Coordinates of C-alpha atoms and ligand atoms in Angstrom, one line a residue:
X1 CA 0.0 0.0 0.0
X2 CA 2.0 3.3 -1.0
X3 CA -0.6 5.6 1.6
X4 CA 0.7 3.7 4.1
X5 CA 4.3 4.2 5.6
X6 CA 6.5 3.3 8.2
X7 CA 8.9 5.3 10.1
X8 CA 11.4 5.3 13.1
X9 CA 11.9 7.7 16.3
X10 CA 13.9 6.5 18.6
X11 CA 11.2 7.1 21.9
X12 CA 7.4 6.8 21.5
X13 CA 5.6 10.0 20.9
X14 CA 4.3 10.1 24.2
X15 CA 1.0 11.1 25.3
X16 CA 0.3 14.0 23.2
X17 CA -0.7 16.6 26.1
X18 CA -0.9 19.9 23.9
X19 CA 0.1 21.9 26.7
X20 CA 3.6 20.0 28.2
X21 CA 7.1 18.7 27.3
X22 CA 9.1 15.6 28.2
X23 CA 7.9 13.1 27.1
X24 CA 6.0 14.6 24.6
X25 CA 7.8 15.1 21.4
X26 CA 7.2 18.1 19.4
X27 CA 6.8 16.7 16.1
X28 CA 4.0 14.7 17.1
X29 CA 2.2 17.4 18.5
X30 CA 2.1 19.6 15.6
X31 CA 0.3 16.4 13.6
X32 CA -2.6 15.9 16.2
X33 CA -2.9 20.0 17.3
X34 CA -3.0 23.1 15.5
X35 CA -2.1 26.6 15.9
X36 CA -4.5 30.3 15.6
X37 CA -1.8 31.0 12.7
X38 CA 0.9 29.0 10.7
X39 CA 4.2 29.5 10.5
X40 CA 5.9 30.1 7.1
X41 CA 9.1 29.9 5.6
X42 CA 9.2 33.7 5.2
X43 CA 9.1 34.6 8.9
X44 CA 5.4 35.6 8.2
X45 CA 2.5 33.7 10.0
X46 CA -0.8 32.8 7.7
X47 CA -4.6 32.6 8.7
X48 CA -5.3 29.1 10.3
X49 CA -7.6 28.5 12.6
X50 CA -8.3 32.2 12.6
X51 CA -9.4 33.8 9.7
X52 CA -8.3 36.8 10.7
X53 CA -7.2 39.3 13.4
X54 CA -7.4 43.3 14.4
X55 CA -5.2 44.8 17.3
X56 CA -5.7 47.9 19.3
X57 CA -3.7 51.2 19.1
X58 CA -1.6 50.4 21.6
X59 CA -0.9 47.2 20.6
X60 CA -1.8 45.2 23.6
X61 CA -5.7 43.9 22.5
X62 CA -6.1 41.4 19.8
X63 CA -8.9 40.3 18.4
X64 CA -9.1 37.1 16.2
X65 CA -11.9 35.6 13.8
X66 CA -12.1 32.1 13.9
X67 CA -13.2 29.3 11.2
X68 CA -16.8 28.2 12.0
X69 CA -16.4 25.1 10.1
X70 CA -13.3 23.6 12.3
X71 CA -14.0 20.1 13.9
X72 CA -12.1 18.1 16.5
X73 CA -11.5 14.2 15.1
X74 CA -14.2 13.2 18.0
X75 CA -16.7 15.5 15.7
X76 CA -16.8 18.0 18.7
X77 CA -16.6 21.7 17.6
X78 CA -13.9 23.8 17.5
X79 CA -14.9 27.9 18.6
X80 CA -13.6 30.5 20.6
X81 CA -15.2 28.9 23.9
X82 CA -13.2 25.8 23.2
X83 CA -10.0 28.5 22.3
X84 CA -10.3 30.2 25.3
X85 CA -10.5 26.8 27.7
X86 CA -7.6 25.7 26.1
X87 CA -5.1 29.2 26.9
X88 CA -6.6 29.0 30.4
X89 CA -5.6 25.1 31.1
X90 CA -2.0 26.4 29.8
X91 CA -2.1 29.5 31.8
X92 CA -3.0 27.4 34.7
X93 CA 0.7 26.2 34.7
X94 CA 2.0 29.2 34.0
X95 CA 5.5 28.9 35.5
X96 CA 6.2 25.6 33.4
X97 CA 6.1 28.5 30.2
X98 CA 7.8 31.3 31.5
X99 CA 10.5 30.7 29.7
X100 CA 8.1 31.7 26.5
X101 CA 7.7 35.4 26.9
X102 CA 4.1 35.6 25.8
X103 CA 3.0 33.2 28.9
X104 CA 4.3 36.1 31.0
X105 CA 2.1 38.9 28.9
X106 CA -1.1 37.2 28.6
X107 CA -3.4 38.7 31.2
X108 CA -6.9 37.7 29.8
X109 CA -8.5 35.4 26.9
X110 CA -12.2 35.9 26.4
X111 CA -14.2 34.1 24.0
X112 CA -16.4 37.1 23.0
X113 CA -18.5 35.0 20.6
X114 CA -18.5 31.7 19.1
X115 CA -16.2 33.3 16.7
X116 CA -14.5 36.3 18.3
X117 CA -11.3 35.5 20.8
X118 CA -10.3 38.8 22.4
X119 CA -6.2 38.4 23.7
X120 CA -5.3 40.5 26.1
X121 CA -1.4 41.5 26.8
X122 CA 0.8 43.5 29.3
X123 CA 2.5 45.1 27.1
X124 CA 3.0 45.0 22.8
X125 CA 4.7 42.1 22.4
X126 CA 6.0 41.6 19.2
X127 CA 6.4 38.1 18.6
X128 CA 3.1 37.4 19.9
X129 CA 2.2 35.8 16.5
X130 CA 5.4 33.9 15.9
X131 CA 4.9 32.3 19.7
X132 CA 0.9 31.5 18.8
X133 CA 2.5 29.6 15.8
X134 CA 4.7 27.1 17.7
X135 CA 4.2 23.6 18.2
X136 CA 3.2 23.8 22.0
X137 CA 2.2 25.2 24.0
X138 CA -0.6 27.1 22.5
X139 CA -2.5 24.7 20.6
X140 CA -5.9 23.2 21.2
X141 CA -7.4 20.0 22.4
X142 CA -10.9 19.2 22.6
X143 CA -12.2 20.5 26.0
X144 CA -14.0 17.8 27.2
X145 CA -10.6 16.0 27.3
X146 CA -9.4 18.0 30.3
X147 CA -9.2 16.2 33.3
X148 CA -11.1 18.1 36.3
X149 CA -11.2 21.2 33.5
X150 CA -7.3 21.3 33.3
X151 CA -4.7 20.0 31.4
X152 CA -1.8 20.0 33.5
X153 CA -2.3 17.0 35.4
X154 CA -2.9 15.3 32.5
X155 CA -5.2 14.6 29.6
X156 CA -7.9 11.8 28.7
X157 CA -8.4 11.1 24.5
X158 CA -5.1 13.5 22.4
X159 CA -8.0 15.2 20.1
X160 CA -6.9 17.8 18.0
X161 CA -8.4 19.0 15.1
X162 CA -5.4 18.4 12.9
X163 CA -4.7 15.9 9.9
X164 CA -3.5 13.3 12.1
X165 CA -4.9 11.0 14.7
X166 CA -3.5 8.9 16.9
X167 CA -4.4 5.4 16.8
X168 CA -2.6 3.2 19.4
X169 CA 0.9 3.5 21.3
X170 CA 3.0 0.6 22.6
X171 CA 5.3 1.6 25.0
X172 CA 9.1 0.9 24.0
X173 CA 7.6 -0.8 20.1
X174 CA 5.6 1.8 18.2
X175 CA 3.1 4.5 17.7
X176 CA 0.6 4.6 15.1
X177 CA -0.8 7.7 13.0
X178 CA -3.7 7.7 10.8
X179 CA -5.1 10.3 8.6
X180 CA -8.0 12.3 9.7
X181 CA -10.9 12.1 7.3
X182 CA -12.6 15.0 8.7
X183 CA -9.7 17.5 8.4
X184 CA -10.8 20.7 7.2
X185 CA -8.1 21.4 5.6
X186 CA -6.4 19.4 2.7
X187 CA -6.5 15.7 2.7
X188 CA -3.0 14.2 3.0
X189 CA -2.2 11.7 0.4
X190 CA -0.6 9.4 3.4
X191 CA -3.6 7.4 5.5
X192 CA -1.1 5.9 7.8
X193 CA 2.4 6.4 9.4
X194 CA 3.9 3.6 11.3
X195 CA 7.1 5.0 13.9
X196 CA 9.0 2.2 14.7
X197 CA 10.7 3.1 18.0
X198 CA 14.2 2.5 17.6
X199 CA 16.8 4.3 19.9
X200 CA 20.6 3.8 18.3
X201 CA 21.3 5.6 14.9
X202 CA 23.0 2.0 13.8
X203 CA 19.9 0.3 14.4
X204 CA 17.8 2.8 12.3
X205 CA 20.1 2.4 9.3
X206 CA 20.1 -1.6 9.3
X207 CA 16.7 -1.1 9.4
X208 CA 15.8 0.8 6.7
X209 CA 18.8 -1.3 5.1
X210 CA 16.5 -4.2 5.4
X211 CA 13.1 -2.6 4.2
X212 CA 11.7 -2.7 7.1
X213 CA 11.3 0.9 7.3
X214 CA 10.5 3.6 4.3
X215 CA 11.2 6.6 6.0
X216 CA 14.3 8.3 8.0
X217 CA 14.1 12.2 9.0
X218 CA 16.2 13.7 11.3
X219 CA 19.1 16.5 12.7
X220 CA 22.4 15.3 11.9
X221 CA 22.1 12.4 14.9
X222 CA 19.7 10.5 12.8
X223 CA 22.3 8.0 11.3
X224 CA 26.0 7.4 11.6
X225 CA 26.9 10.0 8.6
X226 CA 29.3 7.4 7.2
X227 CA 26.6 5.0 6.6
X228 CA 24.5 8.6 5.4
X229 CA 27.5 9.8 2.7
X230 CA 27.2 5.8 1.8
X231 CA 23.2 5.8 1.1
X232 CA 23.5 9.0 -0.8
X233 CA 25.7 7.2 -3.5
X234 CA 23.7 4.3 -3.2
X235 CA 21.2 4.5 -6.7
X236 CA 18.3 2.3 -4.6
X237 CA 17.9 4.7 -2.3
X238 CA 16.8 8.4 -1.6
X239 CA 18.8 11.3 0.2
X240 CA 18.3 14.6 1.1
X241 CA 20.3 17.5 3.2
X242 CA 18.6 20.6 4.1
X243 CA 20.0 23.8 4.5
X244 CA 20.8 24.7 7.5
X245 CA 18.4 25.1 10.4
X246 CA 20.4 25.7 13.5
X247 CA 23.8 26.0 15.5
X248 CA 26.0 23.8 17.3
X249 CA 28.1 25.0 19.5
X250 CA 30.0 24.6 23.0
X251 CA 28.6 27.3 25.6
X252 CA 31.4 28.2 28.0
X253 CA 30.9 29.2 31.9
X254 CA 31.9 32.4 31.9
X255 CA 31.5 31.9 36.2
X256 CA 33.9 28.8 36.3
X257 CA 37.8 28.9 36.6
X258 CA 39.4 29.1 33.9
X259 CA 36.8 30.1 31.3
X260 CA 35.9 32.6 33.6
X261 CA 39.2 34.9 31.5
X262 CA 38.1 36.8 28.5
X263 CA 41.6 35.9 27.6
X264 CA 41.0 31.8 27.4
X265 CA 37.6 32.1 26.0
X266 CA 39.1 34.2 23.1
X267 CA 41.7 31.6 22.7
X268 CA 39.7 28.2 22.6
X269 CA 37.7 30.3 20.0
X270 CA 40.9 30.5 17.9
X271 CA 42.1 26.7 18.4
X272 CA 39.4 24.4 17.0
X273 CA 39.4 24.1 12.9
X274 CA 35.7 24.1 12.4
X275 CA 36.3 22.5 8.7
X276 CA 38.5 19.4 10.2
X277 CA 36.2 18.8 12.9
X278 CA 33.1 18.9 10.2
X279 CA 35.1 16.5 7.8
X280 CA 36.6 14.6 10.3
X281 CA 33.3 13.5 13.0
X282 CA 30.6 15.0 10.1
X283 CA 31.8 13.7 7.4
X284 CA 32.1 17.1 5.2
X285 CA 27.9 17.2 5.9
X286 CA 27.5 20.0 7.7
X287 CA 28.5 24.2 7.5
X288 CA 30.9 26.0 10.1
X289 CA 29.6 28.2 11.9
X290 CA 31.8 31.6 13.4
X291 CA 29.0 33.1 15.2
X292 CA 25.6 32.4 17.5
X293 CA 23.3 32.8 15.0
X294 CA 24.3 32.1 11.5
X295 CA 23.9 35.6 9.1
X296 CA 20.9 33.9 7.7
X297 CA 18.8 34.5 10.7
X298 CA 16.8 37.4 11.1
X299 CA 18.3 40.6 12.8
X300 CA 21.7 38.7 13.0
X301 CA 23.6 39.7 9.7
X302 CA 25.6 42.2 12.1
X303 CA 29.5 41.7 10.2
X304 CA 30.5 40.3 13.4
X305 CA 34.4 39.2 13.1
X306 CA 35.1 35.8 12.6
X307 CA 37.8 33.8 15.1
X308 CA 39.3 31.8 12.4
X309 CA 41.1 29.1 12.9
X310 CA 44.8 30.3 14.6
X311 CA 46.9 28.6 17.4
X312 CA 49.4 31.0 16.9
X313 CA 47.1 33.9 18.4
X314 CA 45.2 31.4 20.9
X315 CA 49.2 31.1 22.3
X316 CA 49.9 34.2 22.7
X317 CA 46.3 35.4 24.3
X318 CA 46.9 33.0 26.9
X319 CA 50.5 33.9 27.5
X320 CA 49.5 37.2 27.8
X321 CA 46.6 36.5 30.3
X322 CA 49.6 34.8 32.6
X323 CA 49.2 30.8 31.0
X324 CA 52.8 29.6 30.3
X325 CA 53.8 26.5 30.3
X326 CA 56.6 24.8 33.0
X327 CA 59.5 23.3 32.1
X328 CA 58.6 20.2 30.1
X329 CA 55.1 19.9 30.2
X330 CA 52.3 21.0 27.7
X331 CA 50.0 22.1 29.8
X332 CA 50.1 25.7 31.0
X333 CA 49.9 26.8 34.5
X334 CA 49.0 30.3 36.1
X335 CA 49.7 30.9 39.8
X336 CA 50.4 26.8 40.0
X337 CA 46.8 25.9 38.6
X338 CA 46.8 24.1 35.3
X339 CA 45.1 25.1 32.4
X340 CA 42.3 22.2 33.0
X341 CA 38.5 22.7 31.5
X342 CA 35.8 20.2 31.6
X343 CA 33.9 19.6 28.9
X344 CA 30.4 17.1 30.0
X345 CA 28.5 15.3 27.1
X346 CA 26.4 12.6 27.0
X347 CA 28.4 9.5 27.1
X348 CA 26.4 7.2 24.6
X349 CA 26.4 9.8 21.7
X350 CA 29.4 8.1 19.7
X351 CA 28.7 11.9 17.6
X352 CA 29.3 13.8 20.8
X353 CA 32.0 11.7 21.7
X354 CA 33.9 12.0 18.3
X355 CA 33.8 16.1 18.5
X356 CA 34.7 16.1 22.3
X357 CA 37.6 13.6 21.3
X358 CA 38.7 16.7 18.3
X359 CA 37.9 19.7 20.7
X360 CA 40.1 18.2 23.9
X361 CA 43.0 17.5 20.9
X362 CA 42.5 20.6 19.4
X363 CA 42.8 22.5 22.7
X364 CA 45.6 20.4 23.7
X365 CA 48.1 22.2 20.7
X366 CA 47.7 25.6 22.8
X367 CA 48.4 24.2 26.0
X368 CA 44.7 23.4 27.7
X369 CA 43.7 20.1 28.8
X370 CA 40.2 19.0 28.3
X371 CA 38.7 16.5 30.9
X372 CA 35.7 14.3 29.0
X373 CA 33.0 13.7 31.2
X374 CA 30.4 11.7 29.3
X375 CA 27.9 11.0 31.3
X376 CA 24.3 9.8 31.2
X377 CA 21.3 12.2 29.7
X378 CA 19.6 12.8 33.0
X379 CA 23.1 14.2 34.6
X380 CA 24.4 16.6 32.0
X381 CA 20.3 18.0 32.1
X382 CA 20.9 18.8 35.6
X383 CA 24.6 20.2 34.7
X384 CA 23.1 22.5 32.0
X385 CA 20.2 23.7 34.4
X386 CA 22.9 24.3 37.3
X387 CA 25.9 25.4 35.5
X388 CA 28.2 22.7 36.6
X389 CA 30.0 22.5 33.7
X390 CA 33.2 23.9 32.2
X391 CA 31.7 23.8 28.6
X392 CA 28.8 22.3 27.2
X393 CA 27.4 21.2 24.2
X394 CA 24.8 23.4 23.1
X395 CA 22.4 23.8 19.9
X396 CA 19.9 27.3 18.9
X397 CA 16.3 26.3 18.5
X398 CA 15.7 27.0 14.8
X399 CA 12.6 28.9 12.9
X400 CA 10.7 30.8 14.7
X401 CA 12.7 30.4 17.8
X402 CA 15.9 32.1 16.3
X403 CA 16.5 34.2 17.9
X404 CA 13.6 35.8 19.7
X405 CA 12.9 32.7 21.8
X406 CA 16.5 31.5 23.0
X407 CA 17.4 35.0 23.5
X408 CA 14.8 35.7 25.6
X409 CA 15.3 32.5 27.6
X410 CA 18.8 33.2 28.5
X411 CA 17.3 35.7 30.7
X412 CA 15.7 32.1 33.0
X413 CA 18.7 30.5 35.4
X414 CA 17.7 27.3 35.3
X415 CA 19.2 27.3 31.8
X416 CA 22.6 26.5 30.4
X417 CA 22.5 29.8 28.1
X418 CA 21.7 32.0 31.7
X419 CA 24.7 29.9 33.4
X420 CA 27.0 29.9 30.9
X421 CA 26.6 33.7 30.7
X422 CA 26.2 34.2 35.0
X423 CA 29.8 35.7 35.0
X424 CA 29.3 38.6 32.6
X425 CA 29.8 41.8 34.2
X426 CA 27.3 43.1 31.6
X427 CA 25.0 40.2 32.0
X428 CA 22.6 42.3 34.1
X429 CA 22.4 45.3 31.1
X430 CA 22.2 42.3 28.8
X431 CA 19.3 40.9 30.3
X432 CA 17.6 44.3 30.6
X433 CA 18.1 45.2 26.5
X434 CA 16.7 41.6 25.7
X435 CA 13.7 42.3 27.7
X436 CA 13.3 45.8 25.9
X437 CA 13.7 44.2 22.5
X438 CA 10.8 42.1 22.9
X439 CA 8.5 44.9 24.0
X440 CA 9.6 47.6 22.3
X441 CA 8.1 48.8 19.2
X442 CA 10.3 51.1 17.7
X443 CA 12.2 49.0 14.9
X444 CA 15.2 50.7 14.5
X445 CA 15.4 50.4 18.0
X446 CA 14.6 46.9 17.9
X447 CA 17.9 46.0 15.8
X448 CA 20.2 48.7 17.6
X449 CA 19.5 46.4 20.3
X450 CA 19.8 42.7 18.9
X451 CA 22.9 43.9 17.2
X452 CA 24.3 45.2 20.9
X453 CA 22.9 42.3 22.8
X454 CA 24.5 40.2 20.1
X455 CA 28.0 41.4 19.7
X456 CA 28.2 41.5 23.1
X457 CA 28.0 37.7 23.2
X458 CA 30.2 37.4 20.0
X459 CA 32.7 40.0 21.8
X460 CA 32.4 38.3 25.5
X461 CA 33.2 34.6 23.4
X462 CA 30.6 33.1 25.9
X463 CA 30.4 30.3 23.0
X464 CA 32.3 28.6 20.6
X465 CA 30.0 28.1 17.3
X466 CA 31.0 24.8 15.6
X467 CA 28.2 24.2 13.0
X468 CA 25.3 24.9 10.9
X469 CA 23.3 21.9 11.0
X470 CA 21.0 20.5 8.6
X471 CA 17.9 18.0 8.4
X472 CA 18.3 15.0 6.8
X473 CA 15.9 12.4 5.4
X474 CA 16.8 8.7 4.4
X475 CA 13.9 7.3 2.4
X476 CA 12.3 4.4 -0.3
X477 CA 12.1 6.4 -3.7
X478 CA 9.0 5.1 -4.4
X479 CA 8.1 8.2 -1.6
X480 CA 9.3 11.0 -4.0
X481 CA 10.7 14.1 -2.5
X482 CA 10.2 14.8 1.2
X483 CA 9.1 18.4 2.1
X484 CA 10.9 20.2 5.3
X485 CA 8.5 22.2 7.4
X486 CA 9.1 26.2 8.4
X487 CA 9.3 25.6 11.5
X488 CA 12.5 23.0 12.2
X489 CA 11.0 20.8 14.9
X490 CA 8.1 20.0 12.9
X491 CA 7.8 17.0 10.1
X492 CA 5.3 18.4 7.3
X493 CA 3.8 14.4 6.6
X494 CA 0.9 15.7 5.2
X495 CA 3.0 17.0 2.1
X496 CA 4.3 13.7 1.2
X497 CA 3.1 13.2 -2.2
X498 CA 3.7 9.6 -3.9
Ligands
QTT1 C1 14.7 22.4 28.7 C2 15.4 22.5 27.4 C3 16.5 23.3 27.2 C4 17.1 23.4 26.0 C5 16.6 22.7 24.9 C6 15.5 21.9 25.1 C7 14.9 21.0 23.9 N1 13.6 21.6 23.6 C8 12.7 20.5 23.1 C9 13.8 22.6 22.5 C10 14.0 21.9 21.1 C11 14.1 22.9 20.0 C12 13.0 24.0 20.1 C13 12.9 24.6 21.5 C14 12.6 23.5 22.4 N2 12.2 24.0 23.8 C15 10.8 24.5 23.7 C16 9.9 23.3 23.9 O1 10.3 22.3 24.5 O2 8.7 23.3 23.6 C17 13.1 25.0 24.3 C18 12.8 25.1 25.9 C19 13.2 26.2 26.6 C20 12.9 26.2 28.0 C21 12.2 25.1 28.6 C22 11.8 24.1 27.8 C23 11.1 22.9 28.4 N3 12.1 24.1 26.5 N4 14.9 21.8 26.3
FE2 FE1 12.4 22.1 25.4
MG3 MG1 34.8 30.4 13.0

């Protein structure tokens, strides 16, 4: 049957709460639940499940027009009572979302008619659109699927009124997807999606190597990227490698001895050869990346200086900064403490593993000796939130998150962007510009103060940008050519066409 396909993640899809995380995943979602207005490629949002939409003078009342002719997949109406339930069962957790500015600014949500939803905000929040558009949390479930009229204790049925329903789960073996033939939008061409759980990237290739799957679509962790530059050449099979849709990068504690100094941040930005590391553990897939945000991304084509590649200058900046090294050793010392930094990853990534292996080499050649700490998922979680690390892996968000949304998060401590940037001595006047960028309304103002917000991070070298990363998709021809979505966490299924 070519409607019918099967796929691999390598966790279940969880239990498809709208309005919560782990162990959601975000993908899955966005095929069940829908958003007011769509995300495009463009960094414009389209009508969705509202029509349309007016604002006040002031920018802080909006007023949408919904569809009348939206249905859940249990036949139940969607309107602007069900609308306004749903923002109040997210609201009700409100501290879960603070990270996502607009759960800070919403102050009211009326349903005014069946058809009229009335927003009210603290202030005129600018990406208020963009953040309506994201996978979660602001998309709708039926509301007689609350439990006790809430959501965040959990859910009954995952109705949505999008394309996709849910059929069964088995924990640890599969979820199943099939289409919904009361969609009011476009019918997909698909009627069922099969995702095979499977949890190691060798696995998934020998699986799709034996035909048991037709489908692979993932960041650049979805398959070893041997076996990927292999399949590409292979004439049986299908590739594909997006442009890029985020960074990778290390994020450095500028509150931890010794990437505390300017001085050594600056000079493990001048040690690693992006390019070698990319065709050494990526295999030549991927982009290097000199800053944050790749120029690409909206308000971020500032001309910020590049630190290319140069151990000569990484040398001398930590000589300078008091790191020389003693008599027949290659580590450097200041006031008897040796140039040591820890770098924590998660231990099973054998991708993770294979850069940290390049960066502690790398590092070695100017006189700093990485520690590797792999460790389990659950521990480096807890290291990010707490800033016990020396550096970090770290990754941006993608479309429509960059860079709004992780800007404005590294304003929350719990996060490894906040902890990583706790010893700034500007930190406090960064934090105040990125809340003023988000509220004020004045665009000129608006990139006067991503550029400054932005070059000091550049200037501070709180990170070290490795990549641009891209999607990649393995798949049976006999699928054709496999859209990408706008927004980079989401898997456009319905836009399969074979
Ligand atoms: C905690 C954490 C930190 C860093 C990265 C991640 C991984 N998540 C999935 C990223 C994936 C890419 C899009 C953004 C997305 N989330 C939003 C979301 O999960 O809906 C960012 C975020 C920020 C703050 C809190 C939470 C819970 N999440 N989780
Ligand atoms: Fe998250
Ligand atoms: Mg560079």
């Amino acid at each position: 049957a070519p409607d019918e396909i099967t796929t691999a993640w390598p966790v279940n899809v969880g239990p498809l709460n709208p309005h919560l995380y782990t162990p959601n995943q975000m993908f899955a979602q966005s095929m069940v639940y829908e958003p007011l207005v769509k995300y495009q490629a463009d960094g414009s949002v389209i009508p969705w499940l509202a029509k349309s939409w007016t604002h006040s003078e002031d920018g802080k009342t909006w007023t949408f027009t919904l569809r009348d002719d939206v249905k859940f997949s249990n036949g139940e109406p969607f309107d602007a009572e069900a609308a306004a339930e749903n923002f109040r069962a997210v609201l009700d957790n409100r501290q879960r979302h603070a990270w996502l500015e607009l759960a800070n600014q919403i102050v009211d949500v009326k349903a005014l008619s069946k058809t009229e939803l009335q927003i009210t905000l603290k202030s005129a929040y600018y990406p208020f659109l963009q953040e309506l558009a994201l996978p979660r949390p602001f998309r709708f479930i039926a509301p007689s699927q609350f439990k006790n009229h809430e959501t965040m204790n959990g859910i009954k049925a995952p109705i949505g009124t999008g394309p996709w329903i849910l059929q069964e789960s088995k924990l640890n073996q599969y979820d199943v997807f099939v289409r919904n033939e009361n969609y009011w939008g476009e019918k997909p061409a698909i009627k069922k999606i099969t995702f095979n759980v499977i949890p190691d990237p060798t696995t998934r290739a020998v699986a799709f190597e034996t035909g048991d799957i037709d489908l692979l679509y993932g960041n650049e962790g979805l398959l070893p990227l041997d076996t990927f530059a292999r399949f590409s050449q292979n004439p049986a099979y299908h590739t594909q490698l997006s442009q890029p849709i985020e960074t990778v990068m290390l994020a450095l504690n500028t509150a931890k001895a010794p990437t505390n100094e300017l001085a050594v941040r600056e000079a493990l930005n001048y040690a690693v050869n992006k390019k070698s590391l990319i065709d050494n553990a990526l295999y030549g897939t991927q982009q290097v990346a000199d800053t944050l945000f790749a120029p690409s991304v909206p308000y971020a084509n500032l001309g910020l200086k590049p630190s290319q590649y140069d151990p000569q200058k990484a040398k001398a900046l930590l000589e300078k900064a008091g790191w020389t090294l003693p008599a027949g050793k290659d580590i450097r010392e200041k006031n008897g403490q040796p140039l040591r930094i820890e770098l924590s990853f998660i231990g099973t990534d054998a991708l993770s593993k294979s850069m940290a292996e390049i960066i502690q080499a790398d590092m070695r050649q100017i006189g700093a000796d990485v520690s590797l700490i792999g460790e389990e998922e659950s521990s480096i979680y807890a290291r990010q939130r707490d800033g016990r690390f020396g550096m970090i892996f770290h990754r941006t968000w993608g479309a429509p998150y960059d860079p709004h949304a992780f800007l404005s998060s590294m304003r929350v401590p719990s996060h490894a962007d906040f902890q990583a940037q706790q010893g700034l001595a500007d930190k406090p006047l960064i934090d105040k510009e990125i809340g003023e960028v988000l509220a004020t309304h004045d665009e000129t103002q608006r990139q006067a103060l991503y550029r400054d917000i932005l070059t000091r991070l550049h200037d501070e070298a709180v990170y070290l940008p490795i990549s641009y990363i891209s999607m990649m998709v393995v798949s049976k021809p006999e699928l054709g050519n496999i859209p990408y979505a706008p927004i980079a966490t989401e898997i456009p299924f319905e836009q399969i066409k074979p």
